[PDB]
Design a protein around this ligand. Sequence first.
Ligand SMILES: NCCCC[C@H](NC(=O)c1ccc(-c2cccnc2)cc1)C(N)=O
Length: 426
Amino acid sequence: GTVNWSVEDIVKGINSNNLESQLQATQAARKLLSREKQPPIDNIIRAGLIPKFVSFLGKTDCSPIQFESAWALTNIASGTSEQTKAVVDGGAIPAFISLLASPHAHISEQAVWALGNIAGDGSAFRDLVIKHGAIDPLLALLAVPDLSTLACGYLRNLTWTLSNLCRNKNPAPPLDAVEQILPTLVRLLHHNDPEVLADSCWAISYLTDGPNERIEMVVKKGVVPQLVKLLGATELPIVTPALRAIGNIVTGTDEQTQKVIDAGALAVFPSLLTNPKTNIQKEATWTMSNITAGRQDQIQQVVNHGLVPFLVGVLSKADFKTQKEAAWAITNYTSGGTVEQIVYLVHCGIIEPLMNLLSAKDTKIIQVILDAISNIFQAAEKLGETEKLSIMIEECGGLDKIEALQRHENESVYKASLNLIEKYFS
Ligand SMILES: NCCCC[C@H](NC(=O)c1ccc(-c2cccnc2)cc1)C(N)=O
């Protein structure tokens, strides 16, 4: 029927003066554009078909050509930026917005998906979608008493598009737009479908990526407890964005950080710090590094929850990137912690795995480690145990690693090494 038409025929039919010939060629185009290996998007664009497609969006009298041209356009809009641009340039954005209120759910859904791909392309288009007024009719589609009545795929599409309106930076989305979408986002975050949950979490993790004021608008809606609950999901696609949102939040103030701790976050971290998926373990250790950068009573909760031996663990054996996150966690802990907390850290076994990392050929981790070693001696000098410490470090090959660092490209490293040898050794 409409399968494997040539571009030339599609053009011939869409140009005819026959609504039905056009409908038939438009469907042909959509099937061509829907093929999986190398769909001829640029050939379609070159033939000048986008303006014609955009006009069919307005044919309210012919519902099926609306759907078909919507789907065709959608396929193109899901390609490169240049391709997405051609769709926007054809004037698709207000036309798609008008279709959100289509009586046919298939058509309105298709518009949702298309606005999703356009906003998702980048900041400028995101903000252009918003200016043309997309947010209200998108939100209106979710104004039902119970989200469970909505079609499963329909609801996944809306959540996904909403998350693209939250998605990029430089600039971050308009404050006024974020405040408008957030209440519905809080609600989706409570909906019982794994995909809606994942997408909602991604949205929140976009909105929490930035300055503390941004973090505050989110934290103020009270989602932190639901984020922590989702942190313990079995589904890795829910846990990955939940962990990102949580990690973003603890880069903010001490008070925003305390919210995460109070919600029970720290109880999930023994799993997260030993998680078999390498990126979850990396994210969890980074998150820990921002927590040890906080208050002394916050360091104490890390301590109280038994997470210090997990940090020793990560430092001892992990992906190198995760180990560097572990280094930062320790330098932060040591610089801001009390003497008793630094003493405990050494009692848990921090020194040897710390020294083994001096071997690493990465200049900035070495300074982080040196930074941390110094902070520990400073605790020891308050207790006059600097000597006993020296021996620990010397027993586990720590000095051979420290002495070797003078013969080193960087001399902020050599100067840090230098000082340590004189001040605390013979
Ligand atoms: N109370 C001691 C906190 C240490 C100082 C404090 N530093 C931090 O908060 C911090 C510094 C560095 C990092 C970090 C950097 C690179 C990778 N992973 C973590 C995370 C947090 C500051 N710049 O104000």
